[PDB]
Design a protein around this ligand. Structure first.
Ligand SMILES: *[C@@H]1O[C@H](CO)[C@@H](O[C@@H]2O[C@H](CO)[C@@H](O[C@@H]3O[C@H](CO[C@H]4O[C@H](CO[C@H]5O[C@H](CO)[C@@H](O)[C@H](O)[C@@H]5O[C@H]5O[C@H](CO)[C@@H](O)[C@H](O)[C@@H]5O)[C@@H](O)[C@H](O[C@H]5O[C@H](CO)[C@@H](O)[C@H](O)[C@@H]5O)[C@@H]4O)[C@@H](O)[C@H](O[C@H]4O[C@H](CO)[C@@H](O)[C@H](O)[C@@H]4O[C@H]4O[C@H](CO)[C@@H](O)[C@H](O)[C@@H]4O[C@H]4O[C@H](CO)[C@@H](O)[C@H](O)[C@@H]4O)[C@@H]3O)[C@H](O)[C@H]2NC(C)=O)[C@H](O)[C@H]1NC(C)=O
Ligand SMILES: *[C@@H]1O[C@H](CO)[C@@H](O[C@@H]2O[C@H](CO)[C@@H](O[C@@H]3O[C@H](CO[C@H]4O[C@H](CO[C@H]5O[C@H](CO)[C@@H](O)[C@H](O)[C@@H]5O[C@H]5O[C@H](CO)[C@@H](O)[C@H](O)[C@@H]5O)[C@@H](O)[C@H](O[C@H]5O[C@H](CO)[C@@H](O)[C@H](O)[C@@H]5O)[C@@H]4O)[C@@H](O)[C@H](O[C@H]4O[C@H](CO)[C@@H](O)[C@H](O)[C@@H]4O[C@H]4O[C@H](CO)[C@@H](O)[C@H](O)[C@@H]4O[C@H]4O[C@H](CO)[C@@H](O)[C@H](O)[C@@H]4O)[C@@H]3O)[C@H](O)[C@H]2NC(C)=O)[C@H](O)[C@H]1NC(C)=O
Ligand SMILES: *[C@@H]1O[C@H](CO)[C@@H](O[C@@H]2O[C@H](CO)[C@@H](O[C@@H]3O[C@H](CO[C@H]4O[C@H](CO)[C@@H](O)[C@H](O[C@H]5O[C@H](CO)[C@@H](O)[C@H](O)[C@@H]5O)[C@@H]4O)[C@@H](O)[C@H](O[C@H]4O[C@H](CO)[C@@H](O)[C@H](O)[C@@H]4O[C@H]4O[C@H](CO)[C@@H](O)[C@H](O)[C@@H]4O)[C@@H]3O)[C@H](O)[C@H]2NC(C)=O)[C@H](O)[C@H]1NC(C)=O
Ligand SMILES: *[C@@H]1O[C@H](CO)[C@@H](O[C@@H]2O[C@H](CO)[C@@H](O[C@@H]3O[C@H](CO[C@H]4O[C@H](CO)[C@@H](O)[C@H](O[C@H]5O[C@H](CO)[C@@H](O)[C@H](O)[C@@H]5O)[C@@H]4O)[C@@H](O)[C@H](O[C@H]4O[C@H](CO)[C@@H](O)[C@H](O)[C@@H]4O[C@H]4O[C@H](CO)[C@@H](O)[C@H](O)[C@@H]4O)[C@@H]3O)[C@H](O)[C@H]2NC(C)=O)[C@H](O)[C@H]1NC(C)=O
Ligand SMILES: OC[C@H]1O[C@@](CO)(OC[C@H]2O[C@H](O[C@H]3[C@H](O)[C@@H](O)[C@@H](O)O[C@@H]3CO)[C@H](O)[C@@H](O)[C@@H]2O)[C@@H](O)[C@@H]1O
Ligand SMILES: OC[C@H]1O[C@@](CO)(OC[C@H]2O[C@H](O[C@H]3[C@H](O)[C@@H](O)[C@@H](O)O[C@@H]3CO)[C@H](O)[C@@H](O)[C@@H]2O)[C@@H](O)[C@@H]1O
Ligand SMILES: *[C@@H]1O[C@H](CO)[C@@H](O)[C@H](O)[C@H]1NC(C)=O
Ligand SMILES: *[C@@H]1O[C@H](CO)[C@@H](O)[C@H](O)[C@H]1NC(C)=O
Ligand SMILES: *[C@@H]1O[C@H](CO)[C@@H](O)[C@H](O)[C@H]1NC(C)=O
Ligand SMILES: *[C@@H]1O[C@H](CO)[C@@H](O)[C@H](O)[C@H]1NC(C)=O
Ligand SMILES: *[C@@H]1O[C@H](CO)[C@@H](O)[C@H](O)[C@H]1NC(C)=O
Ligand SMILES: *[C@@H]1O[C@H](CO)[C@@H](O)[C@H](O)[C@H]1NC(C)=O
Ligand SMILES: *[C@@H]1O[C@H](CO)[C@@H](O)[C@H](O)[C@H]1NC(C)=O
Ligand SMILES: *[C@@H]1O[C@H](CO)[C@@H](O)[C@H](O)[C@H]1NC(C)=O
Ligand SMILES: *[C@@H]1O[C@H](CO)[C@@H](O)[C@H](O)[C@H]1NC(C)=O
Ligand SMILES: *[C@@H]1O[C@H](CO)[C@@H](O)[C@H](O)[C@H]1NC(C)=O
Ligand SMILES: *[C@@H]1O[C@H](CO)[C@@H](O)[C@H](O)[C@H]1NC(C)=O
Ligand SMILES: *[C@@H]1O[C@H](CO)[C@@H](O)[C@H](O)[C@H]1NC(C)=O
Lengths: 624, 624
């Protein structure tokens, strides 16, 4: 095993465990110290204003198993510190018959048991567990634990009658899944249900959704309501909140609803951020976010979706969330988005970016798998004065349209997403910032034009505004992590409405994924404008490439170039001519970003271990 | 619910939990503070000379489940003190994927991990588990833990490759069971295997048996040897030590070998106690003790047996224990005998006495189930100068015979059992002792003759020597726990060789067992004697009746009379005449015995709990 990045890669499968630990590793984002991670969990803003972030964790392994909550905290979403206790950076782990198979996703009741922050989580035990398997009742239940030390440790309620697990009966037969409890307060839902509380007797101020589905009949989000305020044992099933069909798709802008939901959440937003009104705010919109499985041919069969919904009250005192429009939270290699409330009327969302090594060829050599996305403020994106001649505008796929009285303009409403400002400020302020001169891409434009200032490593941000003609057939974008022999190309093609990441040359190492990523982006044309604009921001962080367009579209992916000099970046141009010109302005390079884990050394591997021959006997975990 | 014991019992099923806690409860023996107990485990003499006793325990329940090690200690086998830690009187409990289904029986390596006492125990996980079920490999494994504080707590080795569990591969296919590791040192087995260690490479000073069997083909005791001295991870399977047939019986004196062994142990004894020679002591005998299941129509389908064995070395460097003769360790409601070495060349054995409420009618009202037997010294019982005309002597069923050179006398050898002298001394010294005048039972003998001194409560011992004519057809014995309306009759009938406990009148409460207990007792007739003698000792301890005959035969049973005055005792006589006389001498009553748990209050119930609806979902434990 040679680690010479000035020559072609050898056979890297001969390299030892964690020998490639630093090679492709993100430095500027949330990531476990080592080993396997997946979904964010247990997210909450603590009493001191800091952010507690949990995550599904399997230390010293590079596949999922014994799944536990790893945790850390931050005052600004950006610079983090690990918890350190008797189980290292873990704070909840399998320990009881009811959760011994895994401590799955859960969410926080901020004022819970004895007034302490309390997690409601999926406690798993033995048996087939999966949407394509024959799961039985009891395998997935929901349990409580609380913290008296602000997340350094958690105390589970006892096992038994009237204690853990607190939710165990399947609300409908033949479930595909029954997990990922999302606890939330909702003045909106309380107001809607207030006239029906005699029917159900459920009058608490917390609601909980549980994600699942029904075999052969599509996904389901089940709604529960806390039976009595201040009491956390009894949760009353109201009914299904979201019901979708078996592999139903709302269309090209909306992914596919698959067969089963995972990590679903419920929020209410307005143009500024989170909305906590009872329905009285006419600018507020109710949203559900959710993962779906088995409705996609690639990306691990997983879509991270969202939908705007209109609530209807059923006669039995439950709520039907009728989907008004439906979109995609991230179009790339990410899943398991969780959102949580933050002071100042914010709702903040974060997901998990998996690797692109699905055959597990270099995972042991990495010594870790997975990272988070960046933390994103959610809000209602409103675009005013939109031209009715915007192509496809009245499909209203992942947006709504409201005509002006005179019919000459349209107001567009959709889900907005933007990186939390704390992170953008910290990134910019800690970076070497190069403000670049605007560039007209015309007949003289090369295919690739390096920026006048270049990155110094694999940790940088790019921004640019691309102005296109209304009838352009030109393509433009950014090339990143680039040398002569390796590069990753981010293209937007207004004629097709497709944002792509072409990865055929991303790496000389052939075992990593190289498929083309694709997102749809609607450029809402403004009344009186003779052009249409794409605002593109790109974060490069080790192997993560995370793309944001117009505070709306997100696409996370992976690139693993071998050569030490595959760090460059610049502009891409295709079919730009004297007549079909792309004007690029607001160009900026931020070189360096932030060291997100200042207390961690460069190599936080502790080695990898094997569970031994019993892993296959138990059949629950891969064992490595 | 009335608790008036001066009138007939009402419907006691209406009584609350633990309302009958003290009513039938032993006071003079080892018993858990409350709840469910079964097999003794983790028995060892600590460095300070005290005895550590563990037991299978399910606190606050009256059926088996979440099975754990409860523990206590004693300086004299007799007066005990509970451990008290973070889990009360528990010291090992289910906590890892490999043992979450139960911490089953285990035994002690006195100088184990880092020189500390170390337990090797059966760690159980999910799946069908039982001799009549389709068990799979992994469900039962064997794991290590060690104590740095003399049994107050235990630290398990980590889960994984080269750590716990340490034994997991089935040594043969289609096992009926794979549990109850019995670790022991054996100069005898080391000497026998010394010429074969090149074949196996196993040269350690500890051996371990694991109890089981093969579906359709009878029970098996599997022998392992520690691979290397001072190292405790690697144990090498040598071969089957004991192999018996599917429901094979050696005969009327030997129970039945069933389909599967449980709690088997290996020892070597001589007339004084434990023998630690390499084979050079010609008075020493190798013994195996073992439970069998499914070879009995009653007594929970369980026989606690023993066998004298002659070891043969196989060509592959393993040992066949060939059964020379075979007997019964206790003929009544007891099982799961464990033996352990004690200083002064002793081997001490103790078992579990279950209740006689198999339909679980009053278990909740008790608030507990189970106790230990008394602790018993094992030794080789040798009877000299036995008459060759002793009926059935040369069947050699559960004994051996050696003729004198002239053929006029026989030396009989069998397994001896007697109550440890520490307990007999403490019992006698703390009791009100009545030495009774000898009684000739003849034509004037009533059916029942109360002793001249009577017990004052349900805690007493009786002793007597019954001298019978060589051709008697008379029966005699002891009646205990007796009033006019309730009593329990212990008879010996030399003509049939049967010792019986008739329980048709033991209690007015009809839900308890009332079947007649039966043991075979061989009165070895002495050359020149014109009579044959039965030495009978009986311990009455709450509901336990524990009978010892001739330091050889043991029979433990249960009686639950309701009336407060059903405490009396005396002599039984049937068919005694002027010509067929039974002389009773050495008669003694010890009233009171010892308070075995001086620190415990009378009622140590903590209430009972229900596991809730998930118990049936998991299907592992009853849940109460
Ligand atoms: C199979 O068997 C298993 C083993 O028995 C069993 O698991 C056990 O289950 C029991 C019962 O559910 C659990 O017991 C509970 O424990 C809770 C605390 O748990 C935390 O702390 C314990 C103990 O902590 C000590 O010891 C450890 C070990 O040495 C140390 O490391 C600690 O530092 C600490 O040491 C100090 O204390 C020791 C003595 O205890 C000293 O020896 C020592 O010197 C130190 O001073 C830990 O062991 C726990 O860790 C385990 O669990 C966590 C997850 O929780 C895991 O991450 C970890 O790996 C371990 O597995 C944990 O950290 C107790 O809070 C709980 O007690 C209460 O609830 C019961 C039941 O309701 C009540 O009876 C009791 O009164 C308590 O309730 C009151 O208090 C709470 C708030 O404190 C209130 O909410 C409540 O309303 C009530 O209030 C009352 O009092 C108030 C006034 O005070 C009043 O105002 C109110 O009005 C009201 O009256 C309970 O004891 C036990 O933890 C499990 N153990 C393990 C190892 O798993 C398993 O379930 C069984 N399985 C099956 C299938 O049956
Ligand atoms: C799923 O995830 C699960 C959670 O991660 C996982 O379970 C965990 O597995 C790990 C790995 O196997 C276990 O870690 C081991 O722990 C052993 C100690 O275990 C006892 O103590 C711990 C911790 O004790 C503290 O904290 C608790 C909780 O607060 C307190 O209550 C205690 O009082 C105590 O607190 C003090 O310390 C804290 C910091 O730790 C402080 O915060 C605090 O302020 C106090 O000061 C307990 O938690 C354990 O309880 C659990 O387990 C028991 C059963 O054992 C249960 O009954 C109970 O309910 C709990 O479940 C327990 O009491 C360590 O000994 C062990 O460490 C060693 O081994 C590793 C691996 O080999 C070595 O790397 C390491 O060096 C150690 O080995 C050396 O030391 C031993 C002797 O000490 C030698 O034999 C050995 O050769 C070696 O010696 C070396 O050093 C010598 C010099 O020192 C030198 O001479 C030699 O040459 C040599 O170099 C390891 O850390 C962990 O306990 C599990 N936790 C739980 C909760 O289960 C589970 O397996 C996962 N499942 C799957 C399927 O993957
Ligand atoms: C005295 O000790 C006991 C512990 O032994 C304490 O707890 C009680 O324990 C018994 C078991 O011994 C429980 O009985 C079972 O109850 C089931 C129904 O429970 C629901 O209704 C009752 C009555 O209103 C409620 O009290 C329960 O509420 C509690 O539990 C819920 C969770 O469900 C919590 O949220 C609450 O807070 C409470 O903690 C429940 O709502 C019942 O289904 C179960 O069923 C079987 O029971 C008997 C068996 O003899 C049969 O009649 C019946 O046919 C079922 O039989 C089964 O038999 C076999 C083997 O099991 C199966 O193969 C069959 O298919 C069949 O299912 C049983 O009756 C009792 O609920 C529980 N009480 C509690 C927790 O409060 C007592 O509290 C304690 N007393 C005191 C004063 O301390
Ligand atoms: C680097 O990290 C790893 C952890 O990832 C550390 O541990 C190693 O981990 C790998 C797994 O990544 C283990 O590989 C597996 O080994 C099995 C055979 O093991 C035995 O032989 C080896 C080689 O001589 C010994 O080292 C082992 O000894 C250890 O374990 C025993 C317990 O058995 C202990 O007592 C010892 O003390 C040691 O701890 C063993 O004796 C092998 O069967 C297993 O098999 C599959 O493996 C690959 C998969 O790619 C295939 O080639 C093969 O066909 C099998 O494939 C499976 O694939 C699928 C899915 O799993 C199944 O459906 C198929 O049916 C098929 O079974 C695998 O190769 C390795 O043993 C282990 N080493 C240890 C513990 O020492 C490394 O130590 C660490 N390195 C360093 C320097 O720290
Ligand atoms: O960590 C569990 C949480 O992640 C989510 C969202 O992704 O589910 C993931 C899947 O978890 C389990 O799958 C594991 C499987 O059992 C194991 O055999 C191996 O293949 O690894 C899998 C995970 O990579 C579960 O069985 C699946 O049904 C589930 O999709 C979230 O829903 C969970 O809270
Ligand atoms: O406590 C386990 C130890 O006791 C022994 C000797 O008696 O085995 C007893 C039995 O334990 C298990 O049985 C339980 C069963 O699983 C459960 O469903 C319920 O019925 O209660 C049973 C015990 O009463 C085990 O499954 C059986 O196979 C076993 O006979 C000893 O061998 C164990 O170490
Ligand atoms: C990048 O590195 C490779 C290999 O060392 C080299 O061929 C190339 O000239 C380097 N410089 C570039 C692409 O600017
Ligand atoms: C790479 O090395 C592996 C062993 O890790 C070997 O099996 C494989 O054939 C090698 N690939 C080559 C030489 O292309
Ligand atoms: C309420 O009605 C809906 C629609 O029929 C149904 O799916 C749900 O199960 C009902 N809720 C309850 C608690 O029965
Ligand atoms: C919205 O405006 C477009 C363009 O003026 C028009 O075609 C459509 O009919 C209008 N919709 C409504 C509801 O008026
Ligand atoms: C650098 O980043 C840190 C950590 O996020 C932040 O607190 C600090 O303000 C940043 N420095 C600047 C903006 O100069
Ligand atoms: C644009 O994307 C869609 C998928 O939404 C695809 O069908 C179409 O072929 C793409 N067209 C181009 C030119 O990239
Ligand atoms: C024993 O108690 C019962 C019921 O109180 C009574 O009938 C009997 O006379 C009492 N005395 C005896 C049997 O000596
Ligand atoms: C005893 O009480 C139980 C209820 O605990 C009742 O079901 C049973 O019929 C009663 N037996 C009688 C009256 O004999
Ligand atoms: C040794 O031989 C016996 C008798 O054939 C056999 O049962 C046992 O499995 C053998 N041992 C090993 C380790 O193969
Ligand atoms: C043992 O003694 C009995 C009675 O004398 C006799 O029948 C039997 O043959 C003797 N056995 C041997 C081996 O001499
Ligand atoms: C009474 O019993 C205790 C506890 O076993 C014992 O130590 C003591 O010697 C006994 N008293 C006597 C024999 O007088
Ligand atoms: C004595 O016990 C045996 C069982 O070993 C039985 O077959 C026989 O009937 C009994 N005889 C008498 C008289 O009790």
């Amino acid at each position: 095993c040679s680690l010479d990045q000035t020559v072609a890669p050898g056979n890297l499968t001969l390299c030892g465990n964690a020998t490639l630990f630093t090679t492709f590793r993100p430095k500027a984002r949330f990531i476990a110290p080592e080993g396997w991670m997946n979904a964010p969990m247990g997210l909450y803003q603590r009493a001191d204003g800091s952010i507690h972030a949990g995550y599904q964790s399997h230390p010293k392994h590079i596949q999922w198993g014994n799944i536990s909550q790893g945790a850390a905290y931050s005052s600004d979403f950006t610079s983090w510190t690990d918890f350190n206790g008797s189980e290292g950076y873990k704070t909840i782990w399998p320990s009881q018959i009811y959760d011994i198979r895994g401590v799955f996703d859960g969410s926080i009741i901020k004022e819970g048991i004895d007034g302490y922050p309390t997690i409601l989580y999926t406690s798993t035990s033995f048996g087939p567990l999966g949407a394509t398997l024959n799961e039985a009742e009891g395998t997935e239940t929901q349990s409580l634990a609380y913290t008296t030390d602000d997340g350094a440790s958690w105390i589970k309620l006892g096992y038994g009658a009237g204690q853990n697990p607190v939710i165990y009966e399947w609300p409908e037969t033949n479930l595909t899944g029954f997990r990922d409890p999302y606890v939330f307060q909702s003045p909106r839902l309380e107001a809607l249900l207030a006239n029906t509380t005699s029917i159900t007797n459920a009058t608490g101020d917390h609601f909980a959704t549980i994600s699942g589905g029904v075999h052969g009949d599509g996904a389901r989000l089940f709604l529960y309501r806390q039976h009595t305020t201040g009491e956390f044992i009894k949760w009353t099933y109201l009914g299904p909140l979201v019901t979708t069909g078996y592999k139903e798709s709302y269309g090209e802008w909306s992914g596919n609803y698959g067969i089963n939901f995972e990590t679903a959440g419920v929020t209410r937003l307005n143009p500024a951020g989170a909305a906590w009104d009872n329905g009285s705010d006419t600018t507020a919109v109710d949203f559900v976010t959710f993962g779906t499985e088995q409705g996609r041919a690639d990306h691990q069969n997983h879509w991270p979706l969202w939908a705007a919904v209109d609530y209807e009250v059923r006669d039995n005192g439950s709520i039907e969330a009728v989907i008004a429009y439906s979109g995609v939270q991230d179009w790339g290699r990410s899943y398991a988005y969780a959102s949580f409330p933050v002071e100042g009327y914010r709702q903040v969302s974060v997901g998990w970016i998996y690797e692109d090594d699905d055959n597990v060829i270099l995972a042991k050599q990495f010594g870790y798998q997975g990272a988070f996305t960046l933390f994103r403020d959610l809000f209602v994106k409103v675009v005013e004065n939109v031209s009715p001649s915007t192509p496809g505008l009245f499909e209203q796929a992942s947006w709504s349209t409201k005509n002006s009285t005179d019919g000459m303009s349209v107001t567009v409403t959709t889900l907005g997403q933007r990186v939390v400002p704390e992170t953008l400020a910290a990134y910019k302020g800690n970076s070497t910032v190069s403000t670049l001169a605007p560039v007209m891409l015309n007949e003289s434009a090369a295919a690739y034009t390096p920026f006048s200032s270049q990155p110094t490593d694999r940790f940088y941000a790019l921004t640019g505004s691309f102005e296109f003609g209304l009838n352009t057939t030109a393509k433009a974008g950014f090339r990143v992590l680039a040398s002569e022999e390796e590069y990753t190309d981010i293209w937007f093609d207004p004629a097709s409405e497709n944002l792509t990441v072409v990865r055929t040359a991303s790496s000389l190492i052939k075992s990593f994924g190289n498929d083309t990523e694709l997102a749809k982006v609607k450029l809402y044309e403004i009344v009186g404008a003779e052009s249409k604009t794409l605002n593109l921001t790109v974060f490069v962080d080790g192997s993560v490439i995370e793309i944001y367009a117009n505070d709306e579209v997100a696409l996370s992916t992976r690139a693993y170039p071998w050569l030490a000099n595959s760090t460059g970046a610049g502009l891409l141009a295709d079919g730009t001519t004297a007549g079909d010109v792309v004007g690029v302005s607001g160009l900026e390079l931020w070189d360096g970003l932030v060291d997100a884990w200042p207390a961690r050394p460069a190599n936080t591997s502790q080695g990898l271990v094997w569970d031994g021959p019993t892993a296959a006997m138990y059949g629950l975990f891969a064992g490595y």
